[PDB]
Amino acid sequence: MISSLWIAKTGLDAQQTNMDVIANNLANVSTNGFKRQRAVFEDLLYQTIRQPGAQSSEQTTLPSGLQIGTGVRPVATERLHSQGNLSQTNNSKDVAIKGQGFFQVMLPDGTSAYTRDGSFQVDQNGQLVTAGGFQVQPAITIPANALSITIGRDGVVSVTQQGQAAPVQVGQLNLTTFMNDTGLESIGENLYIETQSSGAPNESTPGLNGAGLLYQGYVETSNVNVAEELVNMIQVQRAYEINSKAVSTTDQMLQKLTQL
Template sequence: MMRSLWISKTGLETQQASMDVISNNLANVQTNGFKRGRAVFQDLMYQTLRQPGAQVGDANQLPTGLQLGTGSRVAATQRLQSQGNLNNTGAEMDVAIQGRGYFQVDLPDGTQAYTRDGGLSLDQNGQLTTVGGYVIQPPINVPDNAMSLTIGKDGTVSVTQPGNTGVNVQIGQLQLATFINPAGLQSVGENLYLQTDSSGPANLLQPGVDGAGSIMQNYVETSNVNVAEELVNMITAQRAYEMNSKAVKTSDEMLARLTQL
């Protein structure tokens, strides 16, 4: 079987994976706090037919070798952590993180998860939760009679209550989790990430302290997907796929010609 058929097959697979990543980015262009992905490729092993620097005759060495590649593969899908745009919603429970950090929530099994989605709401107990119903940690309970809610850049959560108009009463403090390698977090859907050995442990900080981002009330962070850039990447992947398809077709024609001899 011709080597080029298998090499082209790996090229088709890698470009298909690239299209999958691009499609996922475009599908989440309006997802709050979404971080776009990028497929990272690497070449496969080489068959060395002649070593570089091999001795030829008594006094000569080959300046270059003879190595035949075997294709490419997807090495990783990397999350790009650039800041998304801040969209002013006017909703008092919408908050955006400007800078580094994630909100921490508890999953039903007790596992800690992390999110950049600051579209918050209240549950039946008056606790601040994500749109998926996960309680923000540490829990913050908003009184039933709260007239207004104020969230400062430092994460301080305050309310005004009847009889105390103009007086803000602090009821809690938002915290942000930072990671030494946020690209190493594991995506699990619902705008949530899990800590991994690659990400390192979560470091809970007050917003604005030790490199943690600040909190912007009345805003949500939008996706950091650049539609124009993704469309260019899509065209590039499509053309690369077509070229590999052409290589498969050409190799097949050469093989067919060989069998007719």
């Protein structure tokens, strides 16, 4: 209709996506291992009318010609993979991570996902699963007569058998690093899957080769900054305010043109 109205529509859509991201952040406080997400925006086409070069006279140059431009196309959402603030859960199955690294988990379809969530569980068959039976990699099977479990800083998981005066080592729990942590594609369940952007996964025991360390009895909190989200929400509401104002102004312009 008018070049103005499409531009304002793109602006409204951009503010709406930005509010979607803020709402997803704000809802996911108190979710373990969640990574704050933030939208990066990007301006659209520029309809060039007079070429910014294009010497006007035989000598003059015509600096900074006429170009209009449209749109606010949202180009990406970066995920901030910073260390969450650890919290003392004092729970024997809850393990947190300090530094880079992701737990590897075998999805029932046979593919591997990666989670920064150590809110583990032990099922019927003794496996370490994670809130949904997603069996970890490599498998760790607690003996049926084990009493108490411990997970060292180096990932060595061992149990205290009954009667046995020793912590026999049951399994080894290793992490995985991606040379682009941000490029993982989340599929829900607090899980990410490998894509072309993240690059190949390097699996190693904790500590070695850039991975972090494992802290039993702690859980990683979401790195969502509450005040940042609140001011973001105020700013987004006002930007939406203003863009709808622009839509209405273009409406009034067009309507006065109609009754002409």
